[PDB]
Amino acid sequence: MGTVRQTSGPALARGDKVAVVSIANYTETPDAGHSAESIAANTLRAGGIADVRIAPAKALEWARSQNARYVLSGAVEEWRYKTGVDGEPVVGVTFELIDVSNGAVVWSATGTRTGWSRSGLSSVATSLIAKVLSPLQARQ
Amino acid sequence: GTVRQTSGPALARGDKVAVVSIANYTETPDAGHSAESIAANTLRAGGIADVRIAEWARSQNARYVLSGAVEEWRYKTGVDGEPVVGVTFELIDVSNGAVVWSATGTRTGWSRSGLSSVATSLIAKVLSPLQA
Amino acid sequence: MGTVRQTSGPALARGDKVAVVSIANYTETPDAGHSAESIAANTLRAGGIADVRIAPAKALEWARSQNARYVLSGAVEEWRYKTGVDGEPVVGVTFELIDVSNGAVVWSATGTRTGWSRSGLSSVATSLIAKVLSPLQARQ
Amino acid sequence: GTVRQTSGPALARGDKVAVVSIANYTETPDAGHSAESIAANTLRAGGIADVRIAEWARSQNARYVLSGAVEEWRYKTGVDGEPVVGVTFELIDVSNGAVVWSATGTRTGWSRSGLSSVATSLIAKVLSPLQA
Amino acid sequence: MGTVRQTSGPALARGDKVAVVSIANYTETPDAGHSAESIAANTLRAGGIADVRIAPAKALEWARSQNARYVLSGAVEEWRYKTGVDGEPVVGVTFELIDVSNGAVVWSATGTRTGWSRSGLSSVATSLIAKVLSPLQARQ
Amino acid sequence: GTVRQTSGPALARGDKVAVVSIANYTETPDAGHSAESIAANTLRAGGIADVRIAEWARSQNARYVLSGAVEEWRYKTGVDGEPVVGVTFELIDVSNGAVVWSATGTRTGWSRSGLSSVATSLIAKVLSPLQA
Amino acid sequence: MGTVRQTSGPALARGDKVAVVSIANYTETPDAGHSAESIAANTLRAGGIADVRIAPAKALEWARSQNARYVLSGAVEEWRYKTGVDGEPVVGVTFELIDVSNGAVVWSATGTRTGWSRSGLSSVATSLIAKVLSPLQARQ
Amino acid sequence: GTVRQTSGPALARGDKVAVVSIANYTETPDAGHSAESIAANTLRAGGIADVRIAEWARSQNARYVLSGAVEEWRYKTGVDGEPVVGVTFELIDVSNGAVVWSATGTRTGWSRSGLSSVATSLIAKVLSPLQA
Amino acid sequence: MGTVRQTSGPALARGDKVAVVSIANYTETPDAGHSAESIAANTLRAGGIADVRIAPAKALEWARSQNARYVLSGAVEEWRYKTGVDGEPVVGVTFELIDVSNGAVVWSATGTRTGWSRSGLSSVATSLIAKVLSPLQARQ
Amino acid sequence: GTVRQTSGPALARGDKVAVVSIANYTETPDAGHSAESIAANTLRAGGIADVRIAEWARSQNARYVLSGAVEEWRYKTGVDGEPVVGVTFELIDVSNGAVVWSATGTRTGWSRSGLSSVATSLIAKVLSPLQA
Amino acid sequence: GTVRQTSGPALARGDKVAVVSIANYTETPDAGHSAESIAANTLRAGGIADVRIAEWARSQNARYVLSGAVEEWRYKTGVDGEPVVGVTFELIDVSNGAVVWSATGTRTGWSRSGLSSVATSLIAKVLSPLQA
Amino acid sequence: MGTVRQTSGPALARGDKVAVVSIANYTETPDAGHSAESIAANTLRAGGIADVRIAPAKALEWARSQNARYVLSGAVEEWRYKTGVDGEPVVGVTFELIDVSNGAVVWSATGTRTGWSRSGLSSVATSLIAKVLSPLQARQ
């Protein structure tokens, strides 16, 4: 259950360097944004993007120093199990891809998903972040 | 629930819109910031090419500011509690400072629905008149 | 369920400027008055009133500076879910329209409503505030 | 419950009435202020053209002051707890300072009734003799 | 349920001024004595006693200054809902009428009442205080 | 429960009786003061024309002092807990200082009985020998 | 339920003055000893003992000053409702009568009683203290 | 439970016995003092004419001292918890200081039994050899 | 239920003086060791040992001053009701008899016992301590 | 759940790998250190002869660094709560500093499964491409 | 559960053994001291004539030291929780300082079994090779 | 239930001295690592390794001073009962054998096990640690 909404974006190159930078945490799950960061970064690598790097603890101040072409950022709106025994997992994420040249959001997505009650939070998140980030798969 | 939208301008893809401080009148922390992030993306998905999230709007060359407030953003109490969202929006012409467009939307979802889904879906419908 | 009681009032103009000013909160729901403020303001716009503005954090000191013709104020007497699982939402509001020239209450209303237990608080409130504020719809 | 009203003056639409400090003898915060707001509106709806909410009454040129106290204003305990309101009112001639009219009303509502409804409905009936 | 016990008393005049003065609160219901004060005062007016006044926050020091002929005082022994869901309301009151000339209790009453479980505390109290205070109705 | 009264004087309507400090040996606050107020009224209803509520008794010209203590004054625990009262009284000749009359009464009521009723009813029976 | 055990004692006179002095409280019921004091004193009067007096807050220092012939003292070992809803009342008392001349215990008793669950603590106590103190009834 | 008594002296009615400090090894406050009071009375009822409750014994001219300790003195847990008592006693010749008599007794009662009853009954049986 | 394990020991004399000295408390029952001390001492007397004395609050420093021939010591490993309503009592004790001449453990025992759920802790303890200490019965 | 691995180098038994600081993004204390210990052993079992657990890697002559983060490591709530693990890994060439290999794995186990088992089993599968 | 014992010396009745500090790795206070006391007695019952409970061992002329640790010593949770014991022992030659004998034993008992029984019984079996 | 995974290792000698050194505790069971230490040490002795010693409260600084040839270390990842009544015991351990000459891990193992709900934690642990450590049994 849930939906995914994507704007169009550029076809990314295998050699386009991407900085994953502070994914905001708007939930009461500690480190939820950090989990999304890790999950996102590996999604971006699995999608064929050779050089992907997560920022440390504007932000473009940094990404240029790492000679990144783009910055992937976002926020997590929901990341938890619903309350009670057999509460299903629920994830909600937004993502922005930023062109480091001008600071302009060239691609954006929103995805939410409510899981099976016999599913893990990490599983749903991981699946959703992969579907949401699929247009950032490297072009053939 | 419901959605009510007033008349408003026909938006162009090159019209710069700046999303600014969506108030949280709920007990869910960061409800407003979540509403900002979803709104910005809704606008971009609606074809507004340049949307930024924060007077300030002028220095960012924005034509319009999108603002508003969240009135409800939560699961109802108990297990199987259903997600409830309530939001108001206002679209502001930056040159004169006037509300040119405003809207209000509420929604209650199924028991097995995510709150983030309801909110995202609702915010999409409410802001649907700001696409082109 | 519930009732709405309205005094007569003037037929408002599309170009009558209205200031929405501090709606008292007499409930234990934080920001309940602020929610009513936002809801009310958009109701007033949806009703055809072009220039509607909510005051910041007598009060007529301000409304004249904004050249407002009227001030809509009120209070919230109830704004909550009844207690327990499946507690129905309940709203209770009063509203006064003030002529900024003389300070006189020219129109007033009281509305209460108990919702469906499968309804949101925000939904009931929004519906009730719209019915209550309907005589402030702009004249044709 | 019940309502008992004493005799009182025939009120005129131009008689200025000032609602003043309705005591809260309940554990529901702002019960009295809620009773003030509902009363004022009841009076206006009853045709009193000028009703204001706060010696002081003289400086506001009021003929009468409406006052009173709330004795009960709550849901009964437990889920399905029924709303209970109890109120006393007194109408005061400002020139001499005498109670010219007084009334007492209590009411218990259905389980599925709002407290704000009961109170509003009750306060309407109690103050019904102050209309014209 | 409950009983009312009354001594004889004088037949009060419509123009006999009465001061309602500090009704003691012997319960754990806050303001219970104040509620009885308000309820009592209006009962006394409804009973045909023209000038009735409640004292502010012996006491005869005051009542003479207000030229009162009598003082109605008392205490509340019980004023609550019995414990638990559907606990019936229970009221218990005593009342003394004092002649301001000499300080002598010329009339006295005790009333208790246990209510219907679907009844309000305020309703039972109000009814009981009216029955208890009925001999202080003004003579024809 | 029960009531036991010793012999005592035949009281006259003009005999001034002063009720003085009825001890509270319960966990119900003001139990004793409630017992004082009910006692005073019982005495007046019993035809004692002058009863006052506080050595001191002499300065008030009282012939007798009524005193005592409350041993139980509560609802039994749980819902449907029944009201339980237990009281002792002593009547004192003020001139010599001797107990001339004394009595003890206990009572348990129905589940649907008020505590104030039980106490009032019990205190009436116990003090019934002090009427005339 | 329960038992009463009594030693023999003197036949007391109607004019034998008795001081009731500090009945120890060995329970977790506050004022339990004081209740027994009051109950005992009236039992002693009801039993035909004309002058009976309870001491204020050895002890024979006092009783001689009041010209008492005897002192009735004791302790309360149990005075409570058993735990839970419908817990029966339980009383346990010991009593000593002291000759003020020599300080010697001339009469002593122990009584315990478990009540009906629909009985009051005060009722059981009162009944038990009366049975226990019955040999101190005045001789004919 | 059980009772075990050792041999001991034949007590005379004129033998002065002084009850001294019965230790409380329970969580029931004053268990030992309750055991002292019950013991003293048991001894008197058993025909010992002079029994007093507190080296010291010599200055009171006592022949014997009765002492001991309480090991259990409580209701078992839960509603319907049964009362449990456990006590040890020792009888001491004051001249030489030797235990001349000692005894141990435990008892569990019915659910509907008072703790004070069990203890009193048990303490009676245990000390029964000190009567004459 | 439970077992008792005893080493052989000497046949004790009726006139062998025994000091019962600090029985360790290894449970969360306060005074458990003290209870065992009292119980043990009387067991030793009931077993025919004329002079038995419990120490106040090595230890042989004391026992020699009392001219004791032996010291009985030990520890309590368990002394409680099992958890919950109708939790059976459980006792666990070890005992050492010490020759005051040389300090050598000449006799030792371990006993545990789980009681009937309708039994007292004090009863089980008392029974077990008596069985465990039975070889210290005086020889005929 | 699932496992996704990117391409990576063919590892040799003599390639020194150093496991370094696996972040804990869970509320289970030491989740990351547990993940480090299991990973190191998985690598050794996979035939990497020299694996050490902590710039630093250079001074230890390591060719590769294995790192990552734990996103979930817990039993689901309630009794019969099922164990849930979620992990990301990255393999880093020490000379240039580049990720040459990366992987993500999640897993939910039976109710009667140990958490340590799930994690160990999952971490084995995820790192299976780093064996030779 | 189980018991595993290594080989060890044949003990003589005159071999002095000193029990020394048995570690408590449980949340049951004094578990180790309880294990010391039971062990000492087991050894004595096994025919070791001189067993003492505390380098030090030399000054006490002991040949061997018995030591160890408790890993579990508790009732399982809930009512009817079964008692669980787990212990390790080591026997040490004092002259050289070497472990000459070591053993490990665990045991779970019936619901209606005492913890002290399980432990005592288990410790008996584990140490059974140190008898003669 | 559970698994055991072992790398190959050397065939250890009966006279190869082994130091058991700080087994990390990654659980919320206090002393879990210490229990594993004790259990492991005796497993190593039972496996035929004559001289086995546990370290006190790199670490190779110590093992050389004790002339140890190897160090057995590890960590405990899980050591507890699952939550609730009848929660089964669960153990999870890793182990490293270190050559004291060079500091190199020459043998390593991971073992987890979920027990029977009518089993003790100590029993499962003990069994698992013995299976896991079986290749460190001394060669014939």
Dihedral Cα D92, D95, D97, D102, nearest 10 deg: -20
Q: Check: CB of residue D74 under 8 Å from CB of residue D113.
A: no
F12 CB-near residues (< 8 Å, 6+ apart)? F132
**CA-closest candidate to residue D99, choices H123, E51, C135:** E51
Number of domains in chain A: 1
Chains contacting K (3+ CB pairs below 8 angstroms): I, L
Which member of C87, C108, C114 has the closest CB to residue D41? C108
**Measured between alpha carbons, how far is K26 from D10 in angstroms, rounded to an integer?**
85
CA distance L89 to L80: 6
**What is the bridge-based pairing of β-strands A2-6 and A105-114?**
antiparallel
Q: Which amino acid is at A130?
A: A
Q: Which residues on D lie below 8 Å from C113 (Cβ)?
A: 114, 117
Contact F1 G31 (CB under 8 A): no
Name the residue type at position J9: P
CA distance E38 to E27: 17
Chain breaks in chain B (C to N over 2.5 A) after: 54
Helices (H), chain B: 31-45, 56-59, 115-127
Nearest alpha carbon to residue L122 among L135, L113, L133? L113
Sign of CA dihedral F114, F118, F119, F121: positive
Quick check: G92 and H113 CB within 8 A? no
Query: Which among K78, K85, K88 has the least Cβ separation from residue L85?
Result: K78
Kindly list the residues from chain B whose CB atom is less than 8 angstroms away from the CB atom of residue A1.
Answer: 112-114, 117
Cβ–Cβ < 8 Å for J15, J64: yes
Q: List Cβ<8 Å contacts ≥24 apart for G57-64.
A: G58/G103, G59/G21, G59/G22, G60/G98, G60/G100, G60/G103, G62/G19, G62/G21, G63/G19, G63/G21, G63/G100, G64/G100
Q: How far is CA I84 from CA B74, H77, H79, I88, L121, in A?
A: 40, 8, 11, 9, 23
Q: For residue C73, give the nearest of C124, C127, C47, C36 by alpha carbon.
A: C36
Scan for tokens 């509003």, then name that residue: D120
Taking the C-alpha atoms of E31, E36, E37 and E40 in order, what is their torsion angle to the nearest 10 degrees? 170
Question: Could you say which DSSP state residue B95 is in?
Answer: T
- Cβ D45–C110 below 8 Å, yes or no? yes
As a whole number of angstroms, the distance between CA K114 and CA A83 comes to 40
B65 touches B17 (CB < 8 A):
yes
Q: Do H86 and I125 touch (CB under 8 A)?
A: yes
Phi, psi of I111 (to 5 degrees): -140, 135
Q: By CB neighbour count within 10 A (0-12 exposed, 13-18 middle, 19+ buried), where does A118 fall? A: exposed
How far apart (Å, rounded) are the C-alpha atoms in residues I132 and I119? 19
What residues contact A56, with CB distance under 8 A and at least 6 apart?
A: none
Residues A9 and C4: their CA atoms lie apart, in Å, by 52
Q: How far is J44 from chain L (nearest CA, A)?
A: 7
**DSSP result, E43-56:** HHHHTT-S-EEE--
Around Cβ K86, how many Cβ atoms within 10 Å? 30
Distance in angstroms (rounded) separating the CA atoms of residues C123 and C81: 12
What distance in Å separates the CA atoms of residue D64 and residue D67, rounded to the nearest whole number?
10
Residues with Cβ within 8 Å of K123's Cβ and at least 6 positions away in sequence, in order, are: K35, K38, K39, K42, K85, K87, K105
Contacting residues of F for E7, CB less than 8 Å apart:
41, 44-45
CB F46 within 8 A of CB F91: no
What whole-number distance in Å separates Cα of residue E29 and Cα of residue B71?
35
Looking at this protein, which amino acid is placed at residue G62? W
Angle at J57 between CA J55 and CA J60, to 5 degrees: 120
Alpha-carbon distance of C6 to D132, in angstroms, equals 16
* Residue L52 to residues C30, K11, K102, Cα–Cα distance (Å): 66, 22, 11
Q: Kindly report the CA angle at I90 between I87 and I95, in degrees rounded to 5?
A: 170
Q: Is G27 on the interface with H (CB under 8 A)?
A: yes
Q: Which residue of E has its CA nearest to D110?
A: E118
Name the DSSP class of K30.
Answer: T
Helix (H, G, I), strand (E, B) or coil at D46: coil
Token code pair at residue E117 = 């479980």
Chains touching chain B, criterion 3+ CB pairs below 8 Å: A, C
Instruction: List the one residue out of G86, I25, C7 whose CA is nearest residue F78.
Output: G86
DSSP letter, residue H41: H
Nearest to B127 by CA among B73, B14, B48: B48
C-beta separation of K119 from K34 below 8 A: yes
Interface of J with L in 40-99 (CB under 8 A): 40-42, 44-45, 50-52, 75, 79, 81
CA-wise closest residue to H80 among D33, C52, B2, G83: G83
Residues facing C59 on adjacent strands = none
Integer Cα distance of I89 and H106 in angstroms = 14
Element (H, E) at H56: helix H56-59
Interchain CB contact of K4 with L (< 8 Å): yes
Tokens standing for L9? 């290792």
Strand partners, A90: A80, A114
DSSP of F90-116, one letter per residue?
EEEETTT--EEEEEEEEEE--TT--HH
Task: Tell me how crowded residue H52 is: count the other CB atoms within 10 A of its CB.
Answer: 18
d(CA H49, CA G106): 8
Q: List, in sequence order, every residue forming a beta bridge with H69; answer none if it has no partner.
A: H23, H88
Nearest-CA residue of chain K relative to L17? Answer: K98
DSSP of L65-134, one letter per residue? HTT-SEEEEEEEEEEEEPSSTTPPEEEEEEEEEEETTT--EEEEEEEEEE--TTS-HHHHHHHHHHHHTG
Decide: residue A76, CB within 10 A, 0-12 exposed, 13-18 middle, 19+ buried: buried
Q: Are C4 and C132 in contact (CB under 8 A)?
A: yes
Which amino acid does the sequence have at C125? A
Cα–Cα distance, G78 to G32 (Å, whole number): 9
Domain of residue C103, residue span:
1-140
Closest alpha carbon to F3 in C103, G130, H17: G130
Q: Where are the alpha helices (DSSP H) in C11-120?
A: 32-46, 60-65
Q: Where are the beta strands (DSSP E) in chain A?
A: 2-6, 18-20, 24-25, 52-54, 70-81, 89-99, 105-114
Q: Which residue(s) pair with L19 in the sheet?
A: L53, L71
Q: Which chains touch L (3 or more CB pairs under 8 A)?
A: J, K
* Token pair listed for J68: 């990552």
**Is K77 in Cβ contact with L34 (below 8 Å)?**
no
Q: Do chains E and A touch (3 or more CB pairs under 8 A)?
A: no
Q: Which residue is listed with tokens 């449970």?
A: I27
Strand G24-25 versus strand G70-81 pairing type: parallel
> Do the chains contact at A46 and J4, CB–CB below 8 Å?
yes
For residues H5 and H124, what is the distance between their CA atoms, to the nearest angstrom? Answer: 13
Contacts of L77 (CB under 8 A, 6+ apart): J34, J37, J38, J116, J119, J120, L26, L27, L92, L93, L94, L112
Q: Which residues of I touch H72 (CB under 8 A)?
A: 120-122
The answer to whether the Cβ–Cβ distance between C7 and D121 falls below 8 Å is no
Nearest C-alpha neighbor of K85 from the set L120, L78, L81, L85: L120
* A7: Cα separation from own chain's centroid: 15
Tally the residues of chain I: 140
DSSP state of E120: -
**CA–CA distance, G26 with G4 (Å, rounded to integer):** 19
DSSP SS3 for A100: coil
Contact predicate L81/K84, CB 8 Å: no
Tell me the pairing of strands H99-108 and H83-93. Answer: antiparallel
**Torsions phi, psi for K43 (to 5 deg):** -65, -45
CA H2 centroid distance within chain: 15
I28-33 contacts: CB < 8 A, separation 24 or more? Answer: I28/I80, I28/K29, I29/I76, I29/I79, I29/I80, I30/H25, I30/H27, I31/H25, I31/H26, I32/H25, I32/I76, I32/I79, I33/I75, I33/I76
Tell me which chain F residues have a C-beta less than 8 angstroms from the C-beta of G35.
25, 69, 71, 86
Contacts of K81 in chain L (CB under 8 A): 85
Q: Are D126 and D69 in contact (CB under 8 A)?
A: no
Per-window interface: G 109-138 vs F, CB < 8 A: 118-123, 125-127, 130
Is the distance from CB of F103 to CB of F6 less than 8 angstroms?
yes
Q: Report d(CA J103, CA G81) in Å as an integer.
A: 67
Which DSSP string do the residues of J18-73 spell out, in sequence order?
Answer: EE---EE-SSSTTHHHHHHHHHHHHHHHTT-S-EEE--HHHHTT-SEEEEEEEEEE
Query: Which residue(s) pair with J99 in the sheet?
Result: J92
Q: Where are the beta strands (DSSP E) in chain H?
A: 3-5, 17-19, 23-24, 51-53, 64-75, 83-93, 99-108
* Chain E residues close to F41, C-beta within 8 Å: 5, 7, 94, 96, 108-110
Looking at A17-105, list the stretches that DSSP marks H as alpha helix, in order from N- to C-terminal side.
32-46, 60-65
Q: Which residue has the tokens 């600090």?
A: I22
Chains I and H touching, counted as 3 or more CB pairs less than 8 Å apart: yes
